Design a protein around this ligand. Sequence first.
Ligand code: CL
Ligand code: CL
Ligand code: NA
Ligand code: NA
Lengths: 135, 135, 155, 154
Amino acid sequence: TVGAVALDLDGNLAAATSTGGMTNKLPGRVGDSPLVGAGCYANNASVAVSCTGTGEVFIRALAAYDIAALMDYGGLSLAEACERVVMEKLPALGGSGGLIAIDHEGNVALPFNTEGMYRAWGYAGDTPTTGIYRE
Amino acid sequence: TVGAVALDLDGNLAAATSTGGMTNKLPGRVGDSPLVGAGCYANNASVAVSCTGTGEVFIRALAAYDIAALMDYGGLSLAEACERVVMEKLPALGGSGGLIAIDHEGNVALPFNTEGMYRAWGYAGDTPTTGIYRE
Amino acid sequence: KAVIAIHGGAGAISRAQMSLQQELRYIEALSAIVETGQKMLEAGESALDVVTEAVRLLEECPLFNAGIGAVFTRDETHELDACVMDGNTLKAGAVAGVSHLRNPVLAARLVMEQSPHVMMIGEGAENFAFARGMERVSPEIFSTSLRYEQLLAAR
Amino acid sequence: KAVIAIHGGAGAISRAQMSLQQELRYIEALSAIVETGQKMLEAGESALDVVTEAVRLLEECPLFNAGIGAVFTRDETHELDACVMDGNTLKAGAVAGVSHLRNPVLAARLVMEQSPHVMMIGEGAENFAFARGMERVSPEIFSTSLRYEQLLAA
Ligand SMILES: [Cl-]
Ligand SMILES: [Cl-]
Ligand code: NA
Ligand code: NA
């Protein structure tokens, strides 16, 4: 699974997610990656999110939209919503993985509950950060 | 599109949706009906929902999950959430259609913004209500 | 109190074009199916079994656009989707783009119960269901003159 | 204000099994793609074009399980899925179970921009993309020795 989120100079948010799925998966199985609100979501009013992880649990929990709804309706910060979904709700359903998120205010979050997540981010005109492991 | 929602004597909610899709549609087109959180959602904490209508817009708005999130995070009643999604949000995105919903307390809502929705509901051991047109 | 609701689709259902007798066919079909569900709930059946059976019956009913009475695609084919979700466990199952399964909701329940998956599509969904003894049908069984005429009119 | 983030998958990425040289190949690939995104956003390109290009590059990168370097199914086949969403319009596009499209995210953008639909699957998705001039590829192009060995090992 791969993905990207961005906020542009016009204040527009977008998200994309693409995957090969799982080694040895049953032909015809669909994970969260192509499912609006599960593996991918963007709304200028809220957040853009791309997910990666145990797809079934990201579908059951509507992980990407759940971030948006927690912020929009619950008034959670990006960091608070990311903690709630990735560190609490997904593990409670036996899910592992992570996501990237940017909110309408340009806050960026790359939560994961796994050993690693291949990731990077950067502000326009600023130096990029890369990461593989925790910490 | 058809669907059903139910609260049983054990207090468990469930939902199912099944469709042929849209007359003359492109082969390969998927609407909301098989998408968790778009056409179908259930959660004992909130609501069971089955949707019918312009599938594309029910996917973009995550209609079924949005009912739950509006209740759970936004503190809306079933009636308030149903009004918000079917009568305000879906028409704003050019969506038409409706849904059925039962909440964990057994409140029932059958909102639609169309001329008709083939529908019925009933409490166990009571006579059912049927409808085609608007009230 | 246990409760069921069902639908057979929302849309431009025109009063001017209907007779009472035509309307009553729909009312009777909805009443029969909601009554089956009510009786099941009264008898202590699970919400999951009640919604699966109510949807199987709405599929079986040719008046409704699911299962028998499915609308036609651009190519005069039938492609059927379905989903079921259990609010207790939050498990779900779903199929999309299936043509050779009489009851999509039962195949969606098969995905939930006999796989670790939520969603299967197309030929792989069908092969998964056939490997578990679900019967293969010709999509011709779904075809009704009423829906075929809505396609001809749609063109 | 303008900002991009990317990922290449979350999972049990093992430090014990990696050399620094292997890790640097991932850092280099992530850095190159996020810098392309930053440059595009600095230049006033839209968030939708920035996420589409960043994902096409992660698909192109054989180190990541999307596009080239896609994992194998039980049947030693490739089935690819993608989605893109525009937070301005809340339009979305997605494909699932496509085997003959080099770049799934571009097919998903094609669904968003060149159809009235949000999600297309399988051969129908492929036929829709081919009718709009996207090229047909053999699913063999996605295959890498590395991913084929992870299938044999499983
Ligand atoms: Cl009469
Ligand atoms: Cl070294
Ligand atoms: Na039917
Ligand atoms: Na790749």
